[PDB]
Design an enzyme around this catalytic site. Structure first.
Site, PDB file in Angstrom:
ATOM      1  N   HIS B  43     -52.446  -9.427  51.320  1.00 39.10           N
ATOM      2  CA  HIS B  43     -52.590 -10.881  51.262  1.00 39.10           C
ATOM      3  C   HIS B  43     -52.868 -11.537  52.622  1.00 39.10           C
ATOM      4  O   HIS B  43     -53.322 -12.681  52.693  1.00 39.10           O
ATOM      5  CB  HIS B  43     -51.366 -11.525  50.576  1.00 39.10           C
ATOM      6  CG  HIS B  43     -50.210 -11.808  51.492  1.00 39.10           C
ATOM      7  ND1 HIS B  43     -49.052 -11.059  51.492  1.00 39.10           N
ATOM      8  CD2 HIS B  43     -50.003 -12.810  52.382  1.00 39.10           C
ATOM      9  CE1 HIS B  43     -48.180 -11.590  52.331  1.00 39.10           C
ATOM     10  NE2 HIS B  43     -48.735 -12.652  52.886  1.00 39.10           N
ATOM     11  N   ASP B  99     -49.370  -5.246  47.146  1.00 37.06           N
ATOM     12  CA  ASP B  99     -49.719  -6.077  48.283  1.00 37.06           C
ATOM     13  C   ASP B  99     -49.605  -5.256  49.576  1.00 37.06           C
ATOM     14  O   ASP B  99     -48.654  -5.403  50.338  1.00 37.06           O
ATOM     15  CB  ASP B  99     -48.770  -7.268  48.298  1.00 37.06           C
ATOM     16  CG  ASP B  99     -49.174  -8.326  49.286  1.00 37.06           C
ATOM     17  OD1 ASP B  99     -50.321  -8.308  49.766  1.00 37.06           O
ATOM     18  OD2 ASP B  99     -48.335  -9.186  49.579  1.00 37.06           O
ATOM     19  N   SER B 198     -44.935 -12.912  56.737  1.00 36.72           N
ATOM     20  CA  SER B 198     -45.562 -12.011  55.777  1.00 36.72           C
ATOM     21  C   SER B 198     -46.473 -10.964  56.411  1.00 36.72           C
ATOM     22  O   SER B 198     -47.127 -11.219  57.425  1.00 36.72           O
ATOM     23  CB  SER B 198     -46.237 -12.779  54.630  1.00 36.72           C
ATOM     24  OG  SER B 198     -47.295 -13.597  55.052  1.00 36.72           O
TER      25      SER B 198
HETATM   26  C1  LIG Z   1     -47.556 -19.288  42.490  1.00 37.04           C
HETATM   27  C2  LIG Z   1     -47.242 -17.802  42.535  1.00 37.04           C
HETATM   28  N1  LIG Z   1     -47.664 -17.027  41.445  1.00 37.04           N
HETATM   29  C3  LIG Z   1     -47.196 -15.808  41.897  1.00 37.04           C
HETATM   30  C4  LIG Z   1     -47.282 -14.531  41.258  1.00 37.04           C
HETATM   31  C5  LIG Z   1     -46.721 -13.408  41.917  1.00 37.04           C
HETATM   32  C6  LIG Z   1     -46.094 -13.516  43.171  1.00 37.04           C
HETATM   33  C7  LIG Z   1     -45.990 -14.764  43.814  1.00 37.04           C
HETATM   34  C8  LIG Z   1     -46.548 -15.926  43.185  1.00 37.04           C
HETATM   35  N2  LIG Z   1     -46.561 -17.236  43.634  1.00 37.04           N
HETATM   36  C9  LIG Z   1     -46.020 -17.819  44.909  1.00 37.04           C
HETATM   37  C10 LIG Z   1     -46.639 -17.155  46.149  1.00 37.04           C
HETATM   38  C11 LIG Z   1     -47.944 -16.582  46.051  1.00 37.04           C
HETATM   39  C12 LIG Z   1     -48.553 -15.947  47.141  1.00 37.04           C
HETATM   40  C13 LIG Z   1     -47.844 -15.874  48.378  1.00 37.04           C
HETATM   41  C14 LIG Z   1     -46.522 -16.452  48.485  1.00 37.04           C
HETATM   42  C15 LIG Z   1     -45.918 -17.099  47.363  1.00 37.04           C
HETATM   43  N3  LIG Z   1     -46.015 -16.275  49.740  1.00 37.04           N
HETATM   44  C16 LIG Z   1     -47.069 -15.588  50.327  1.00 37.04           C
HETATM   45  C17 LIG Z   1     -46.900 -15.174  51.801  1.00 37.04           C
HETATM   46  N4  LIG Z   1     -45.837 -15.859  52.590  1.00 37.04           N
HETATM   47  C18 LIG Z   1     -44.404 -15.826  52.410  1.00 37.04           C
HETATM   48  C19 LIG Z   1     -43.624 -17.004  52.399  1.00 37.04           C
HETATM   49  C20 LIG Z   1     -42.226 -16.928  52.223  1.00 37.04           C
HETATM   50  C21 LIG Z   1     -41.553 -15.664  52.049  1.00 37.04           C
HETATM   51  C22 LIG Z   1     -40.152 -15.585  51.872  1.00 37.04           C
HETATM   52  N5  LIG Z   1     -39.337 -16.624  51.881  1.00 37.04           N
HETATM   53  N6  LIG Z   1     -39.459 -14.457  51.805  1.00 37.04           N
HETATM   54  C23 LIG Z   1     -42.385 -14.488  52.066  1.00 37.04           C
HETATM   55  C24 LIG Z   1     -43.782 -14.572  52.243  1.00 37.04           C
HETATM   56  N7  LIG Z   1     -48.239 -15.293  49.577  1.00 37.04           N
HETATM   57  C25 LIG Z   1     -49.508 -14.586  49.939  1.00 37.04           C
END
Ligand SMILES: Cc1nc2ccccc2n1Cc1ccc2c(c1)nc(CNc1ccc(C(=N)N)cc1)n2C
Lengths: 10, 252, 27
Positions: B43, B99, B198
């Site tokens: 990602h 991922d 991330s």
């Molecule tokens: C809207 C939705 N549908 C999903 C389906 C599967 C997994 C996440 C999903 N989400 C929320 C989502 C989607 C994509 C995301 C995301 C959060 N967060 C990131 C990357 N940044 C990130 C931000 C916060 C945290 C954490 N608090 N541990 C960890 C990683 N990407 C690249």
């Protein structure tokens, strides 16, 4: 706010 | 990293910063697995919903760092990407399944007291350590709060959570290629990865051989350090076969 | 990797960081 890195890498 | 603390010097020598050239900025966390291989979350490179789709030349890998914004002369090493490899079945359409991504550096990085690779887990190591309650370590230069940025690499130790608990904390479909970590509302303690973290590593120190192994890759989360929410991580061992094949197919 | 996971400033010189004990106590 990142310090300039040696232009050699860009 | 929310509710973590300043890393000690040389505490996470495999820590890698995925740096954007133009503009110059922190893109993601990553990790050093050998002199020419850097591991991160797919990602961080490809993610259509956020119009993210970087190519080798758009990026720079900064290794051996401690300070977030400062160019650490004589300490850090900045490498260029020869090639990026994203899991063929990485699914950004439904849930960020698989991922994971590998980046081959143009030329080998020299190890030092600040630059050193982390181990990838074998079946037995993963089985023994990937258990609810066992703590792992997450590090990064991401936000300190959901809604500032740290001056130095942050570190936080977080407990692995039971899969049922992980599933019941969200409406998102959890796959076997993911695991969650963090404290429960009644456990008192807290901490979590956050934006900017991330792609970073979730490591554990094996009590059997005293080596650090990367069990997870900061993948996704809902908010940052929210009570009742947990950080989700790419299950590194579950996707090791892909890692193995890519490294010995195009690697060194 | 043959020497992976052993940090130059810690494992290599038999020094332990400030919070690793927390990890090992949870195992
Ligand atoms: C809207 C939705 N549908 C999903 C389906 C599967 C997994 C996440 C999903 N989400 C929320 C989502 C989607 C994509 C995301 C995301 C959060 N967060 C990131 C990357 N940044 C990130 C931000 C916060 C945290 C954490 N608090 N541990 C960890 C990683 N990407 C690249």
């Amino acid at each position: 706010d990142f310090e300039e890195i040696p232009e050699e890498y860009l | 990293i929310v509710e973590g603390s300043d890393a000690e010097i040389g505490m996470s020598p495999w820590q890698v910063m995925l740096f954007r050239k133009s503009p110059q900025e922190l893109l993601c966390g990553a990790s050093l697995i050998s002199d020419r291989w850097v591991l991160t979350a797919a990602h961080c490179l490809l993610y259509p919903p956020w119009d993210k789709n970087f190519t080798e030349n758009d990026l720079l890998v900064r290794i051996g760092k401690h300070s977030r914004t400062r160019y650490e002369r004589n300490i850090e090493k900045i490498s260029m990407l020869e090639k990026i490899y994203i899991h063929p079945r990485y699914n950004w359409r439904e849930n960020l399944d698989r991922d994971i991504a590998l980046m081959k550096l143009k030329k080998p990085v020299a190890f030092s007291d600040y630059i050193h690779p982390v181990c990838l887990p074998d079946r037995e190591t993963a089985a023994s350590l990937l258990q609810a309650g066992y703590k792992g370590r997450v590090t990064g230069w991401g936000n300190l709060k959901e809604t500032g940025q740290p001056s130095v690499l942050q570190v936080v130790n977080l407990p692995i959570v039971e899969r049922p608990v992980c599933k019941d904390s969200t409406r998102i479909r959890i796959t076997d290629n993911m695991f969650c970590a963090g404290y429960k509302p009644d456990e008192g303690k807290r901490g979590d990865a956050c934006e900017g973290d991330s792609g970073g590593p979730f490591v554990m120190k094996s009590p059997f051989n005293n080596r650090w192994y990367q069990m997870g890759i900061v993948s996704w989360g809902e908010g940052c350090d929210r009570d009742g929410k947990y950080g989700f991580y790419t299950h590194v061992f579950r996707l090791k076969k892909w890692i193995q094949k890519v490294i010995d197919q195009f690697g060194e | 990797e043959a020497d992976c996971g052993l940090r130059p400033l810690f494992e290599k010189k038999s020094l332990e960081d400030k919070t690793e004990r927390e990890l090992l106590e949870s195992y």
